[PDB]
Amino acid sequence: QVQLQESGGGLVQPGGSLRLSCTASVGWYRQISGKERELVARITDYSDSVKGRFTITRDNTKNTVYLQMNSLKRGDTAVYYCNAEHIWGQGTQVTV
Amino acid sequence: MERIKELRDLMSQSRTREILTKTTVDHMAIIKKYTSGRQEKNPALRMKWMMAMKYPITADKRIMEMIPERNEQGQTLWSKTNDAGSDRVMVSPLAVTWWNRNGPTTSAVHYPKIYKTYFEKVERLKHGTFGPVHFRNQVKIRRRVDINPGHADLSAKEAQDVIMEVVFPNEVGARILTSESQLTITKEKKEELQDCKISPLMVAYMLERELVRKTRFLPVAGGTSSVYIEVLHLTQGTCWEQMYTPGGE
Amino acid sequence: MDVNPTLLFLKVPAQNAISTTFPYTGDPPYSHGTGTGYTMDTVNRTHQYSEKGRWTTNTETGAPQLNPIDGPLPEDNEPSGYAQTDCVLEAMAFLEESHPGIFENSCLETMEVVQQTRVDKLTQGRQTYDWTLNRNQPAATALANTIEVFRSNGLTANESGRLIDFLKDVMESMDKEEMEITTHFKKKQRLNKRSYLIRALTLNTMTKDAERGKLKRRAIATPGMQIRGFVYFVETLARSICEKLEQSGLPVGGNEKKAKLANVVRKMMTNSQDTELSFTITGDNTKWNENQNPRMFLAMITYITRNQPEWFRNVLSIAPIMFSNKMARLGKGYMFESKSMKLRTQIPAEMLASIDLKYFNDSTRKKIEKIRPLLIDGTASLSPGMMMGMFNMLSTVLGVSILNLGQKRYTKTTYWWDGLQSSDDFALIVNAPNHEGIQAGVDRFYRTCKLLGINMSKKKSYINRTGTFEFTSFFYRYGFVANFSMELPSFGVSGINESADMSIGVTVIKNNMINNDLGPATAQMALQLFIKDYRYTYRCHRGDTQIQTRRSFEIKKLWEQTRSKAGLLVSDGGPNLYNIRNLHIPEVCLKWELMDEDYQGRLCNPLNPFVSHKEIESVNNAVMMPAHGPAKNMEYDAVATTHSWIPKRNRSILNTSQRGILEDEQMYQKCCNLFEKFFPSSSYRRPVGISSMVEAMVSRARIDARIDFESGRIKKEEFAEIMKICSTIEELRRQ
Amino acid sequence: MEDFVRQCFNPMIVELAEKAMKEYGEDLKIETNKFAAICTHLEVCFMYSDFHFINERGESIIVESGDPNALLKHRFEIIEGRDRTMAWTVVNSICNTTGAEKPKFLPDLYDYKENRFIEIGVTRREVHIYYLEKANKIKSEKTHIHIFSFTGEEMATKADYTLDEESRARIKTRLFTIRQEMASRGLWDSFRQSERGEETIEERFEITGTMRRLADQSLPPNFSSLENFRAYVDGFEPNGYIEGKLSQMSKEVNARIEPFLKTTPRPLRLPDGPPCSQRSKFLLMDALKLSIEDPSHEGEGIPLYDAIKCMRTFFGWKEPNVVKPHEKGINPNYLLAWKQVLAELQDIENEEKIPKTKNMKKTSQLKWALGENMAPEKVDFDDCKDVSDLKQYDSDEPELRSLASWIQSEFNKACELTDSSWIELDEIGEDVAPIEHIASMRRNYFTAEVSHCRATEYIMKGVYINTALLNASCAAMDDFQLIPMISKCRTKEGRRKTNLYGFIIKGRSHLRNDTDVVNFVSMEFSLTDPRLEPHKWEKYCVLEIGDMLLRSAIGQVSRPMFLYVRTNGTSKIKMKWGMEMRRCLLQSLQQIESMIEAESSVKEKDMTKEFFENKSETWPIGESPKGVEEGSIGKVCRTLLAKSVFNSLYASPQLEGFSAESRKLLLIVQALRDNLEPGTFDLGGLYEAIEECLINDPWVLLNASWFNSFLTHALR
RNA sequence: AGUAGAAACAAGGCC
RNA sequence: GGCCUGCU
């Protein structure tokens, strides 16, 4: 019914910025090594760990949900997954 | 015979004898309303809560000698445990339905004659003729109108003496009704209800309702007639008018 | 997309969809425990709004009383109870001048009523604080107990059967050295003068439940029986007065209120020319009852009753005299819990005077510390102001005087104002040639209100242009708009009985269609839902279903027995024939022609053991406490059927020391039934006289045996038997 | 003079006359000659009536003493000697039985032979004037009148004297005994003329004694007595006293109007704290349904058998294990309770006929889960005063909690359509009037719109659950009871179906007050993993109980299937109000019908059909990141129904307070938008009144967020 | 524990 | 263990 394609992951330095996107054809979750999958943002609603640092936006016209991540820290190192209401993307690595 | 006999039996016991002796007639009402039962604040909640019990209603003791204690499968119909502050016994709701399927039967032909107002309403509606519904803004203006369509041009007190003389001819006292309209009403309602055995109190209440004029303030648009106000809910609305002509006309 | 109903107001005006803003589909807030905290808070608040008054100690009750009347004028917008005697007397004088003959006439009718009123009128009231037992009891029970105590003490003027004589006895009781009361645990206890004075001047405090529209709970009060007659007379006078005032809206219903509001707004705006601007203030009064001093009501009534018989003035003045010295019982008490030892305790409120303050929190500790000086014999003196709207009508009179004081003849300025007042709520239409004029007019109205001990709630009030306003949950927007959310709680089974519930439900649907502009399809849906709930509540299902219940067997056999099953009542598991056209017809009469004669006779049988009728007042009257309003009574059309049973009573009296009340109830009811069989008109018209029961009963036995022989069943043998049995009961009453 | 009535007359007559004296309320000490005269009248009445009997013939039998027999009939039966009420009772009874005419005044006796009344009066004056006097007092009278007078003479009309003459000799001997006994006394200076018909009284209500002193302490500060204050009031006249105090009063006492503009209103502040948790008594958005496709109706059937049959329809059961703990309770108790429920369900399945209602064993597991024997024992204060821990019940403002995004999504999906019809309405009288046809068509349209709505499913769930819980509490007060959550719907194909969400175990429910709490434990199947929104399930314990396979194009999902288990509670009032959730349908559809009628008052025609089919007109019913979104009338119906359902589900005092204090501000904002120059006296006070209602309830916080969004979109 | 929210329930009393 | 009450 919906298929979800993520993009924009990778390797970034402490204090840096990174921009994820999800094309659907809605929110972002992350899972750190040995930890449970946590909500990052959904569209707005935001985890306390990322408030004032990460901003989620949604273009309904193009069914696309961008996540702008600023002021990145080593504790934000995770696999980041898009979700749409549940359908999940494949997951994109973010390494700070 | 009987009446004076339970009178003597009551006077036999000291407490009831004292109550009968020291209590004056005027205090009749007070002691009759003397009760420990508070008036319920939330009737719906407890009616929905009591009906889930066994033996939730109350009935006179005589029920114990007209209805069997149990039905075919053994569901109990009444209990012998009396109410809190009365000699009546608590009984189950089935004892009602049982009374409607095997209880004693009578001749209810005179109930239409007693409940004149309701049957007149039914007759008026049965022969009514409806019309097209017209959709247009209705200017509802608030007016004082008479709701009772059978009022005989009498007030509460004015017709109360008539009602007593019709039902309780001996307790009238000084009053002997002067107006001849009251004379004819007394004659008619006396010969009509000469042997009706429903109850003196209900007969008096319904005569009061029928003869006494009553008035209330309501938002009306058109109509204004007594027969046209009882169906005010069906003929007038917020944006629609339903032409109607009761059976009387 | 996120759904948001409130955004609907961006297209539909607020008043056209105001019903959405009334969450009357859920359980209303209830209080759980004691109301003592609220009572203490109210007492302290009433006493501190008048702190700048003068203190005195009553020589009779020995309680401290605070008189703020003629006190320093307020210098802030906070609530103040410093009413000025001269200002209020002048306001009443102007009210009389604008309505000549109002006071004299109203006093004349009140004098007629007072001198022809009876004692039994006091029984027609809800719970009252009986001082014989120090608890709330039904009005009739408390009246009977007080009469018994008075007769035992030697005050027997009430035997005249006149309420004025009962009040004479009540006042004479105030001058007695030692009265005697009865207590069960029977013990005879002696009350001295001061203790009886305080017991007669005290009020019982409870917590108001089922109050929708506020986060916090409030406290309400119930007076005794000694003071209710004076209150009745004073309220009769006030009602007779307000009925002559078109600016009042308290003694009328809702539709009359709407009509008067429309008339006043049209009068104010229409008469205003193009040059004059008009503004409506939707005002609520903060702490209305706490700032109304009974002494000022005494002043108003003594001005009203000028040039009248002195006895009338005295009897009408007794009430505010007692309210000025009124005491309030703190309440049920306080319950403590100890989790370490895992126990709970309940201390009565009367211990608050001496109990240490280690158990109470900071707020309650401070409240008790502040209220202790006013504690006298377990009750707190509450002289400064009224507790809970006992003098509603006099307060409305004062508000109407304020409203009329701006008729442009007393303003002496271009601006002027009018409006409608109903205690604690008002709508004020003020016109003036310019915004400065409107501001000056509203300022002067507020200032004059503060001179009469009346405060305007600035937080719950707002002013706009005329054409849109609110009044007691009635929203006017170029014409009143229906709400239908205030009457939603009344769409279920009332809880009286089967026939009564059916008739009440259909009649409520009809009325809300007539008044609250309920739609046809909505009314049909309401009928369907009400029928469903009615069948599911009384276990009376259609009969053709297989829903097993405790009553599904007898219903099913009655169904299979009946031939014309369309005539069966819904109470007996029959089809529902109701519709928009049939909402004004009782169920029995609507199905009369369809019933089988056997079932019809079994149903409407006078000899049924279920139907019980007590008095003409309780035949077809049901007391339904409406949501957001005072308790109200409704006439419901119903036919006396076997379904008109009355439900079971509480039955918890059996575990209390007050267990003998049930035996007295049974004996009184037996005697009353015997009298009714002797005097059939006992119920319809309450008998009057000064003789005793047995005299009337035996003498009527004599005469009825006589005449019923002169034609009837009796025989000489039986007639003589009755005559000598009457003689026997005569000699028995001798000894 | 009273010494005469002390001496001669018998007690019976003197107390009869004393009660007649009390009758009309005049005192005996002022004028006693009336007492003597009327007591002599009463005496002649007796002596004339008694000693006179009749048998089956006429021709009265006269016996000096009534012998023991049934033959004790009295010739003349007395009228007077009774109260006015009874005298008129006898008058009316005689008239109605004898068919005679009713006199307007009081007679004295009745007789059979001549079947009529006797009005005996013996006056001081001679008979031949008093007779016709009382005759012209009585109008057109057939009652025969007979009077004596002291000289000894008798008279009567018709020359009629109704009984023996020796009795009349008796009467006049009695008469002259009276006369020449006063001769020894000497009373005729007034006896002939002592009564003139005085009737006057003044009502006296005198304040005296203690009650007077109280009146002296209920005056303004500078008054000393009620007399002086009343004199001052009577002498008071208006002389411009309000103006003087208005001028002297400080000018800081004002009601200045603060203009209300677009930039004036500020957004309502929401409380901050831990996220808001779930409060509902059952799962709303995460419910799962096990079905059988039976033909039974809503109430038709037996609960336990239907539940077991529905549960047997699912395969894939696994041994339950903890997934998300309660975080405050003992999850192993919940696990053991679930396994116990399964075991006892099988136990019922084995036996002969499924019981209509089952009772469960009271194991320690459900003893803890249902809170049994935890209420502190009630004791007396005199026995527990030295306990330091003894204090009041915790009475403080509830914990503060911030809004979470789950309630918004729950409401969003509570307004969505479904693949079933969750309302099966009852029957109504066949429509006879055209207006009834219009109403029926409108009602059918709304039922088609709202029946396939999650709000209706929630309504039915709540109604059924609360009804069953209340009935079980009232019936099985002591013993824990099992109740399967059942709801019956109808598919698109038309086949009826049952659905089993889970089970409820009701505990001890000895509910006396309307606020007393009955505790139960609720278990509900679901597929929503609780590891994604843990803060919404603070009070739940969630286990893993199986796996479900729903047909999907992605092979087949084989999702996990969890059990949400929690301890909840209700009260009689809450149960009663939750069993009347069907009035949410009313509220909503009344609002929609009011909209339709208001619009149709403009165009003189019913506008329902085009509203529901064309769907051209739309109302703002939500906001998307792109902007405000409008939906058809049906979506408005569903949205209002969901709002009412959530009002009934999350009801609380916070909701009422916020609703009132926000309706005030909504009216002010509407006045602003209508260009009506709104003004306020203290807007900060209103804001503080609104903000104090928002504490921890998810529903009220969501309403406040909606109000802030409406303000942001409005004021433009 | 839970319900609930300015104080309560989580049975009461009587033997 | 036995019995009483569920707005008093």
Numbering used by the authors:
A (entry chain F): 1 to 25, 34 to 51, 58 to 99, 108 to 118
B (entry chain C): 1 to 249
C (entry chain B): 1 to 185, 207 to 756
D (entry chain A): 1 to 716
What does the publication say?
Using cryo-EM we determined the structure of 17 polymerase-nanobody complexes at resolutions between 4.5 and 6.7 Å; this is sufficient resolution to accurately position each nanobody bound to the polymerase heterotrimer. Nb8191 binds to the PB1 N-terminus and PA residues 405–420, 531–534, 551–557, and 624–626 (site 4c). Nb8190, Nb8191, Nb8192, and Nb8207 caused a significant reduction in viral titre at most time points tested. Nb8190, Nb8191, Nb8192 and Nb8207 were shown to significantly inhibit viral mRNA synthesis. To probe the effect of nanobodies on this interaction, the binding of purified recombinant 1918 polymerase to a Pol II CTD mimic peptide consisting of four heptad repeats, phosphorylated on serine-5 of the heptad repeats, was measured in an in vitro binding assay. Nb8191 and Nb8192 were found to significantly reduce the binding of the polymerase to the CTD peptide. Quantifying the cRNA from these infections shows that all the selected nanobodies significantly reduced cRNA accumulation.
Central to the replication cycle of influenza viruses is the viral RNA-dependent RNA polymerase which transcribes and replicates the viral RNA genome. The influenza virus RNA-dependent RNA polymerase is a heterotrimeric multifunctional machine composed of polymerase basic 1 (PB1), polymerase basic 2 (PB2) and polymerase acidic (PA) subunits, that catalyzes both primer-independent replication (vRNA to complementary RNA (cRNA) and cRNA to vRNA synthesis) and primer-dependent transcription (vRNA to mRNA synthesis) in the nucleus of infected cells. PB1 houses the polymerase active site, whereas PB2 and PA contain, respectively, cap-binding and endonuclease domains required for transcription initiation by cap-snatching. High-resolution structures of the complete viral polymerase from a number of human, avian and bat influenza A viruses, as well as influenza B, C, and D viruses have been determined. These structures have revealed that the polymerase is a highly flexible macromolecule that can assume a variety of distinct conformations, enabling the polymerase to perform both transcription and replication that require different initiation and termination mechanisms.
